[PDB]
Design an enzyme around this catalytic site. Structure first.
Site, PDB file in Angstrom:
ATOM      1  N   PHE B  22       0.841  -1.199   0.000  1.00 45.92           N
ATOM      2  CA  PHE B  22       0.000   0.000   0.000  1.00 45.92           C
ATOM      3  C   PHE B  22       0.883   1.259   0.000  1.00 45.92           C
ATOM      4  CE2 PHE B  22      -4.003  -2.009  -0.027  1.00 45.92           C
ATOM      5  CZ  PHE B  22      -4.060  -3.043   0.904  1.00 45.92           C
ATOM      6  N   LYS B  40       8.302   8.073   0.525  1.00 46.82           N
ATOM      7  CA  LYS B  40       7.447   6.877   0.581  1.00 46.82           C
ATOM      8  C   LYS B  40       6.047   7.307   0.972  1.00 46.82           C
ATOM      9  CE  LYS B  40       6.997   2.369   2.752  1.00 46.82           C
ATOM     10  NZ  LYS B  40       7.572   1.373   3.662  1.00 46.82           N
ATOM     11  N   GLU B  98      20.615  -4.051  -2.628  1.00 44.77           N
ATOM     12  CA  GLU B  98      20.780  -5.008  -1.521  1.00 44.77           C
ATOM     13  C   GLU B  98      22.239  -5.428  -1.394  1.00 44.77           C
ATOM     14  OE1 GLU B  98      17.794  -8.207  -2.032  1.00 44.77           O
ATOM     15  OE2 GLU B  98      16.388  -6.712  -2.733  1.00 44.77           O
ATOM     16  N   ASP B 137      12.321  -7.632  11.335  1.00 41.83           N
ATOM     17  CA  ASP B 137      12.229  -7.985   9.891  1.00 41.83           C
ATOM     18  C   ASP B 137      13.613  -7.957   9.272  1.00 41.83           C
ATOM     19  OD1 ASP B 137      10.437  -8.904   7.808  1.00 41.83           O
ATOM     20  OD2 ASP B 137      10.183  -6.901   7.008  1.00 41.83           O
ATOM     21  N   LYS B 139      16.354  -9.336   7.394  1.00 45.07           N
ATOM     22  CA  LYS B 139      16.500 -10.307   6.304  1.00 45.07           C
ATOM     23  C   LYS B 139      17.278  -9.604   5.186  1.00 45.07           C
ATOM     24  CE  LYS B 139      11.811  -9.236   4.510  1.00 45.07           C
ATOM     25  NZ  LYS B 139      10.782  -9.652   3.508  1.00 45.07           N
ATOM     26  N   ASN B 142      16.368  -6.287   3.504  1.00 45.73           N
ATOM     27  CA  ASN B 142      16.375  -5.066   4.317  1.00 45.73           C
ATOM     28  C   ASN B 142      17.752  -4.599   4.695  1.00 45.73           C
ATOM     29  OD1 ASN B 142      13.687  -4.650   4.195  1.00 45.73           O
ATOM     30  ND2 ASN B 142      13.247  -6.097   5.845  1.00 45.73           N
ATOM     31  N   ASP B 159      13.445  -0.496   6.523  1.00 44.33           N
ATOM     32  CA  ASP B 159      12.126  -1.128   6.654  1.00 44.33           C
ATOM     33  C   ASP B 159      11.775  -1.468   8.091  1.00 44.33           C
ATOM     34  OD1 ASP B 159       9.650  -2.078   6.237  1.00 44.33           O
ATOM     35  OD2 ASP B 159      10.216  -3.796   4.965  1.00 44.33           O
ATOM     36  N   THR B 178       8.867 -13.038   7.305  1.00 42.09           N
ATOM     37  CA  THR B 178       9.137 -14.133   6.372  1.00 42.09           C
ATOM     38  C   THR B 178       9.532 -15.394   7.137  1.00 42.09           C
ATOM     39  OG1 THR B 178      10.040 -12.430   4.894  1.00 42.09           O
ATOM     40  CG2 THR B 178      10.342 -14.787   4.250  1.00 42.09           C
TER      41      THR B 178
END
Ligand SMILES: [Ca+2]
Ligand SMILES: [Ca+2]
Ligand SMILES: [Ca+2]
Ligand SMILES: [Ca+2]
Lengths: 132, 318
Positions: B22, B40, B98, B137, B139, B142, B159, B178
């Site tokens: 969203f 953002k 990344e 989060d 991972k 991020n 994030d 995740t």
């Protein structure tokens, strides 16, 4: 629910402009990018029985009430936009931008390079399979 | 607060950098300074019962955490604006991609070099944990680079949408990240703290060195079951050149009991990160990552994501 999480993300890319409703103009370009090529008369019908209230668009409540490896065969057919049997860098990038996801040149080139067994710079079906 | 003026008064808005669930991210430029940021646009839920959009409670939490953060390895928040439909975050522009994508361009990577990047992540997490902030989060997607074309690229953790201040009151409920990266306490609906981030770090490190995912199964259930059971291995296929020190680092983070898991402070004193002698040091320089499998993993991950997206569109398209 967990399924809510999935139905929420789908709705977003169907709802290109994010005003909260799927138009048939939006539903069509979503399906163009999935490799399909349907006509407005088809598109309108699909909208017409998800459209519970009857206002000509799909909102989330309506989208959500429509509820009910193979996904790799079908997934290859989406990537190979021109049906020639091979995914090029251009197809990969173009097809994924149209699905919302902005890959860098570097991501694209890593993807093709790691899947490309015979070294022609493109990914054929078997090559795709070995990757997945 | 959330500034209620028109962001377009103060920013030029550029190309679209990201297309979240969203949210959209666009590059922007502050007119007065010429400095570039990322804007953002987070869509607010339009009513309380609507499952679409982000609640104000969630947006305030994220912003309240972001406003506090000032560290060279964590993304910073510049300003926040709000209109009828959106909360607009003006964030540090983090454009190097990344970490894993950068690393995957390399010919070879030693454990030495890998810990130089690892160290930065650990410093960013030690800073967050010192402020009682749990990321929840962590991972590889991020873990980004500020700029990939310098000789020593700088990690930025990003994030914070799942992040919480750890306090007696709720670390919880929309905590679902995740499967491959979540700690057992998350999967089993048990108390959460700072320790969940430490597990995540062990999973990241595991993949860094090997190009394999420790707890991944064919399905989401097997994955979560393997996390709950702490069922993993160092397979010779992936880990034949991995040092004893590195294995022990992973081993002390992939621990069910959150109280027995290494803290962020422990992790920074650990001899794989901080050798006590040359023996431990040279070993780190002699010992290299499985780069063929690491590249296969980074690339397969991106193909897996794209498919998963298409397959999702496909299911609904019918
Ligand atoms: Ca729309
Ligand atoms: Ca409708
Ligand atoms: Ca083709
Ligand atoms: Ca090929």
């Amino acid at each position: 629910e967990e399924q809510i999480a999935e139905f929420k993300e789908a709705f977003s890319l169907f709802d290109k402009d994010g005003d909260g409703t799927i138009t048939t103009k939006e539903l069509g370009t979503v399906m163009r990018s999935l490799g399909q090529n349907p006509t407005e008369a088809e598109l309108q019908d699909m909208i017409n029985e998800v459209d519970a209230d009857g206002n000509g668009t799909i909102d989330f409540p309506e989208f959500l009430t429509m509820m009910a490896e193979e996904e790799i065969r079908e997934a290859f057919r989406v990537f190979d936009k021109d049906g020639n049997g091979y995914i090029s860098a251009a197809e990969l990038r173009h097809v994924m931008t149209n699905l919302g996801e902005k890959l860098t040149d570097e991501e694209v080139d890593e993807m093709i390079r790691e899947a490309d067994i015979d070294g022609d710079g493109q990914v054929n079906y078997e090559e795709f399979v070995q990757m997945m | 607060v959330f500034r209620q003026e028109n962001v377009d008064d103060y920013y030029d808005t550029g190309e679209e950098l990201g297309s979240g669930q969203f949210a959209v991210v666009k590059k922007c430029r502050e007119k007065s300074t010429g400095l570039q940021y990322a804007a953002k646009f987070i869509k607010k839920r339009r009513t309380k019962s609507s499952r679409r959009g982000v609640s104000r409670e969630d947006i305030e939490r994220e912003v309240s955490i972001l406003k506090e953060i000032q560290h060279p390895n964590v993304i910073t928040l510049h300003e926040v604006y709000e209109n009828k439909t959106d909360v607009i975050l003006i964030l540090e522009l983090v454009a190097g991609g990344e970490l894993f994508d950068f690393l995957a361009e390399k010919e070879s990577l030693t454990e030495e070099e890998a810990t130089e990047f690892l160290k930065q992540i650990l410093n960013g997490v030690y800073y967050l944990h010192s402020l009682q902030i749990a990321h929840f989060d962590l991972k590889p997607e991020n873990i980004m680079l500020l700029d990939r074309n310098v000789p020593k690229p700088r990690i930025k953790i990003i994030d914070f949408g799942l992040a919480h201040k750890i306090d007696f009151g709720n670390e919880f409920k929309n905590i679902f990240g995740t499967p491959e990266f979540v700690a057992p306490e998350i999967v089993n609906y048990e108390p959460l703290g700072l320790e969940a981030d430490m597990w995540s770090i062990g999973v990241i490190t595991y993949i860094l060195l090997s190009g394999a995912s420790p707890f991944l199964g064919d399905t989401k259930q097997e994955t979560l079951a393997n996390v709950s059971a702490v069922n993993y291995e160092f397979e010779d296929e992936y880990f034949s050149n991995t040092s004893a020190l590195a294995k022990d680092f992973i081993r002390r983070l992939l621990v069910k009991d959150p109280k027995k898991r290494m803290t962020i402070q422990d992790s920074l004193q650990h001899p794989w990160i901080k050798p006590k002698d040359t023996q431990q040091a040279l070993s780190r320089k002699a010992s290299a990552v499985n780069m063929e499998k690491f590249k296969k993993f980074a690339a397969r991950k991106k193909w897996k994501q794209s498919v998963r997206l298409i397959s999702l569109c496909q299911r609904l398209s019918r």
